[PDB]
Design an enzyme around this catalytic site. Sequence first.
Site, short mmCIF file in Angstrom:
data_model
loop_
_atom_site.label_atom_id
_atom_site.label_comp_id
_atom_site.label_asym_id
_atom_site.label_seq_id
_atom_site.Cartn_x
_atom_site.Cartn_y
_atom_site.Cartn_z
N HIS A 1 0.76 -1.15 -0.11
CA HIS A 1 0.12 0.12 0.06
C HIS A 1 0.59 1.30 -0.06
O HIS A 1 0.22 2.17 -0.31
CB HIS A 1 -1.04 -0.14 1.34
CG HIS A 1 -0.28 0.21 2.44
ND1 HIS A 1 0.41 -0.79 3.34
CD2 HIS A 1 0.04 1.46 3.08
CE1 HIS A 1 0.72 -0.28 4.54
NE2 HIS A 1 0.69 1.20 4.29
N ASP A 14 0.71 -7.60 1.47
CA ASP A 14 1.02 -6.26 1.70
C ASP A 14 2.51 -5.85 1.55
O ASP A 14 3.02 -5.13 2.42
CB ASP A 14 0.43 -5.44 2.93
CG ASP A 14 0.22 -4.00 2.90
OD1 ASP A 14 0.88 -3.42 1.94
OD2 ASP A 14 0.00 -3.37 3.88
N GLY A 19 4.20 7.19 9.11
CA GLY A 19 5.45 7.50 8.86
C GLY A 19 6.53 6.30 9.25
O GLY A 19 7.28 6.02 8.63
N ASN A 20 5.83 5.48 9.91
CA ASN A 20 6.75 3.97 10.22
C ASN A 20 6.28 2.96 9.22
O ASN A 20 7.00 2.11 9.34
CB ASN A 20 6.37 3.68 11.63
CG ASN A 20 7.22 4.56 13.10
OD1 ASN A 20 7.60 5.72 12.34
ND2 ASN A 20 7.16 4.06 13.94
N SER A 21 5.28 3.35 8.44
CA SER A 21 4.98 2.16 7.59
C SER A 21 5.76 1.90 6.62
O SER A 21 6.35 2.53 6.16
CB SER A 21 3.38 2.34 6.91
OG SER A 21 2.84 1.40 6.41
N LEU A 26 -5.62 -26.33 -6.21
CA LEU A 26 -6.16 -27.90 -6.51
C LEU A 26 -7.44 -27.84 -7.11
O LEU A 26 -7.75 -28.71 -7.97
CB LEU A 26 -6.24 -28.47 -4.89
CG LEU A 26 -6.24 -29.96 -4.80
CD1 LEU A 26 -6.35 -30.36 -3.32
CD2 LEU A 26 -7.05 -30.82 -5.66
N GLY A 27 -8.55 -26.97 -6.65
CA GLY A 27 -9.60 -27.02 -7.07
C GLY A 27 -10.85 -27.48 -6.64
O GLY A 27 -11.65 -28.14 -7.12
#
Lengths: 4, 268, 278, 202
Positions: free
Chosen positions: B62, B93, B155-157, B207-208
């Site tokens: 993001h 993310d 700010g820390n992201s 796998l389905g």
Amino acid sequence: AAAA
Amino acid sequence: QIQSMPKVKERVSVPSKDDTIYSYHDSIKDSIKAVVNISTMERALGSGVIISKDGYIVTNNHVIDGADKIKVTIPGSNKEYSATLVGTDSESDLAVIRITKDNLPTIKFSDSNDISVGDLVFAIGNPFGVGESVTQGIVSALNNFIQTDASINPGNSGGALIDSRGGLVGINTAIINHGIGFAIPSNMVKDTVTQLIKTGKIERGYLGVGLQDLSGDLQNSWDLITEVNGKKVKNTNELRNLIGSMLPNQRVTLKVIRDKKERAFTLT
Amino acid sequence: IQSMPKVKERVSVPSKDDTIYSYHDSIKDSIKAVVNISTERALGSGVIISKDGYIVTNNHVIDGADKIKVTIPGSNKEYSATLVGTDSESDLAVIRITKDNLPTIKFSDSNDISVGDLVFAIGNPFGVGESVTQGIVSALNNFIQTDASINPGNSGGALIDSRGGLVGINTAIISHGIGFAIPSNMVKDTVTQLIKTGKIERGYLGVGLEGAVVISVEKDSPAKKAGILVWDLITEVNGKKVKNTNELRNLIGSMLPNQRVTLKVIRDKKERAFTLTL
Amino acid sequence: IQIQSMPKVKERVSVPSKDDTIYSYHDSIKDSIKAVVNISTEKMERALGSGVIISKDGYIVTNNHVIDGADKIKVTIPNKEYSATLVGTDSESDLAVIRITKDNLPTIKFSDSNDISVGDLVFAIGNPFGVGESVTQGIVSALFIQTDASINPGNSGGALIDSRGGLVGINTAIIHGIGFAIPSNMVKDTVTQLIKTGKIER
């Protein structure tokens, strides 16, 4: 989104 | 019959010397040089962590999603570097970018499966490409997602969540108060950024079959199109195949034939 | 003008390549006694008191809960719990589960703590794992103030010291960066009086919002029997003059009920009344 | 790629594990608490903010925005009710100086703010409502001085002290979890000029  | 703790006799503090202070700087002095700014500085966007000597960087998906010309700044120098996108996992993310620089300060990964609640951790980030930004807390809760009472903000992201050794325990991820932040564990970050660098994206495995868990119908306890079957804990099988990584080998378990089957998770 | 000697040394934690700094060993045992309070979705946390099955929580955690259920952190799943008491004025309540050999939270003396003590707020939000927060004692008053994040997950959980001893019970108050907790001495006193009796140390409270204004007079109460109508203004209980509502509520709570008190009521004209609290 | 993993964690270090001793920063912040005053008005919900004593004869530094618009400022020491008077202001630095008429007041010693680094232990002391002190623990986040300790309107104008208890900054509550404070070396110069002259030239 797919494989085998 | 209420149990009680003994009387408090002594009280231990930090050094009471008029000559010395108590700090965490030495524990974090090195890791700060591996956390970079990420811009397109007046208008910046998130932080990033150098993970390779030759110029590979980790950030949140993001953080970068939408930009056209990613530029980074390193602690020191003050020069801006053109960054190119390598991979972007939407579910995790996580994203990897690269700059053309050598002998960069890198960060060393800590094993996020050896941490306990109460561990001292620091959230490092470079929000505006002029300096660092460290916040202090502890590991609040464990598992997939690390909760910490250290300030995890935009700010820390994309920045670094380190232990007291400076080792990367996770990548900060700001989501939308409660004073509790989240961070993608380092083991998950390690596995994702290798697949993003090697193959360019995250390859899952399919796998389905549609899965469900037994609760009252407990009995004795193809691929291309459709199926609706059961399994023991219908949550680990989806994780075992998403980690199966495109066209490997397959093992299974019995029930009857095809639909309304039961898969038992175990070996290879 | 006065200045400090310039700093020469700078000490840190261990921070060796093999060694991390971590409070885990100090909090490991106190975590086991912080259970989850469930209803019928869950919304709260509690602390085990008796080795059993007696558990302390907030009163507002269970106020209006259909069926109390207790997920305890012992690799266990949903127990059944019954209500023992609910001291409304102290925001405390006790519940009991049928289980022995339980981890118990040893109480720490709330009168020994001072501002700046390293504390930890433990919770059990969803019965899947603990939720520890780190902080200090911010201020003392009659609760405890903590800069460790107190949240609805922590509410009713343990506030401990560095030894892992209960110094408070966490209470969340509608959201600031300051949390509050009920001192452990007040909890221990209120819990014991709740496991013995139903715990009550007051009579009536037929009142509400120059003293305190009466808003409601409960039916079959000492206030109605004496003749305290609505819109009465209690000025003096016995001899001590009452300034506002909180001052009055303190006096009625200090009295051990079933004792005689005279009041001073001003309904345009001062009118006194003798009553017997219930 | 070449991801560099770190050595496994072998040992875990905590605080003294004794059952008779607690870990606490009280002995370090006890003296500085005595110097953080409350700042209210004459006309409880009269609170403006906090301030710290910087001289034993009654000088108090605070934020300019805490006392902006007041009758004459009432100060409470951790005592009751003291009348103050404006000594000087500087809205650029957001610092103000007021004075009460007391003697031998608890004074706050200044630390050289040029010696602090990102990661230093700091405490944000404040007297919000005159009935007692409020302290919050954090670290130096960035170098204004950025900190992860709580900086709320109750802390504004209060003290930001190091582990010794010396002033490394005066809090400023800018109305997520990133508080700010004015470094102690700049506060040292600003209050010196505000006491000498009426304000600051520059």
